[PDB]
Amino acid sequence: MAHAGRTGYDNREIVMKYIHYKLSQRGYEWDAGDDVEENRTEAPEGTESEVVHLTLRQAGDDFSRRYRRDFAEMSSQLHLTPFTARGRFATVVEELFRDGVNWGRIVAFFEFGGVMCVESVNREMSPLVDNIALWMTEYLNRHLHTWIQDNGGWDAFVELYGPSMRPLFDFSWLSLK
Ligand SMILES: CC(C)OC(=O)Nc1ccc(C2=NN(C(=O)c3ccc(Br)cc3)[C@H](c3ccccc3)C2)cc1
């Protein structure tokens, strides 16, 4: 069996943390159920897990900061709807893994869900924030679970998008229209 290794990250946390952070950046306070604003304990319990999120959230944030215009153009205009939001989410995701899955694309998947959350809050659709991120956890663990396991897991990604890893190659923008 498997025991002691560099693989075992909870996609649920990688998402919630990503959405919880990306949302705070836009001045949004997403209430992912668990709300404990009275425990400033930064104990070294899950330092490794934090990296997968820090390096990940930083990886996408770096690309977004460069193409903020292209993002704000599609985001600000992105027509969100709880009736076809799930359907559109798949369309954007399908493109991400349409030509194959790679650490780069995986970055768009996380950045994608973040945009929707920020766009939902604008249209007074906070409830969507929980639905969007939720679909990410399921999708990530549904299909992206195996692939990531064969791509050295988040461990490999962390090394590719580590803190020292200067601005390297980017992912093909999921041009949808
Ligand atoms: C974040 C990374 C992956 O970079 C991106 O490519 N992001 C990305 C790209 C395009 C859109 C768009 N969303 N669209 C939606 O209609 C839509 C609706 C609801 C939700 Br939830 C998400 C997207 C447009 C759309 C219009 C018509 C048909 C299908 C989709 C295209 C959104 C996000």
Q: Where are the domains of the chain?
A: 11-161
**Nearest Cα residue to atom 2 of ligand 1:** 108
User: Token digits for 130?
Assistant: 């929980």
Cα of first residue to Cα of last residue in the chain, in angstroms, is 46
How was it solved? NMR
Q: Which atom of ligand 1 approaches the CA of 111 most closely?
A: 1
Four-way CATH pick for 11-161: 1.20.1300.10, 1.10.437.10, 3.90.76.10, 1.10.1050.10? 1.10.437.10
Å from CA of 136 to ligand 1 middle: 14
> How far is the C-alpha of 141 from the C-alpha of 125, rounded, in Å?
25
For the chain, the three-class secondary structure string (H helix, E strand, C coil) is CCCCCCCCCCHHHHHHHHHHHHHHHCCCCCCCCCCCCCCCCCCCCCHHHHHHHHHHHHHHHHHHHHCHHHHHHHHHHCCCCCCCHHHHHHHHHHHHCCCCCCHHHHHHHHHHHHHHHHHHHHCCCHHHHHHHHHHHHHHHHHCHHHHHHHCCHHHHHHHHCCCCCCCCCCCCCCCCC
Q: Is there a contact between 11 and 145 (Cβ–Cβ < 8 Å)?
A: yes
Å from CA of 5 to ligand 1 middle: 36
Sign of CA dihedral 85, 116, 113, 104: positive
Question: Could you count the other beta carbons within 10 Å of the beta carbon of residue 10?
Answer: 15
Question: CA torsion angle for 125, 131, 132, 136 (degrees, to 10)?
Answer: 170
Å from CA of 8 to ligand 1 middle: 30
Å from CA of 89 to ligand 1 middle: 7
Residues at CB less than 6 angstroms from ligand 1: 74, 78-80, 85, 88-89, 91-92, 96, 108, 111-112, 115-116, 173-174, 176-177
> How far is the C-alpha of 57 from the C-alpha of 14, rounded, in Å?
9
